[PDB]
Design a binder for these strands. Sequence first.
DNA 1: GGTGCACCTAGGTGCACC
DNA 2: GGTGCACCTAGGTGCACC
Length: 132
Amino acid sequence: QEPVILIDKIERCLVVEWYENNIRREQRISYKKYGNDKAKLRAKELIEKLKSGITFEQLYPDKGPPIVRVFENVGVYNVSLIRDRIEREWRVEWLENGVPMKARWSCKKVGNDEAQKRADTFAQSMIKGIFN
DNA sequence: GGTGCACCTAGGTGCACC
DNA sequence: GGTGCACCTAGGTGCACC
């Protein structure tokens, strides 16, 4: 169930295959392009990142569903953090007095990193109990 | 036949420009 | 302040050399 390096001599590429929950996911590294030494090193780098706890989506957000829910229904307020590729924005959803509410930050303005930082700071500070 | 450098392309991304 | 559209990187492959 740990991440593993596979060889595809027909495609002339490595394949780093690992399992999250019960789903398998692979990432190809062509040694036709990168070469044997570089490919093995970059695959090691990805192995290191997966050892750190990084998930699939934060590595390849381009791949997967358009709307991704980082977490949802967090106890009270049912706080949720969402990444939306269609509208290219970071959103937070919660329930204040049984009322659905949401905020959004664009990525076109500040970028993926700052938009995630502001949405995360907003959401976790909401869980701390200091926002209206 | 195997290998990897050198190009090429499509699509995400975020800055500049008002 | 919001967009358009100039960049950038990843992914794919031909092509002289082992």
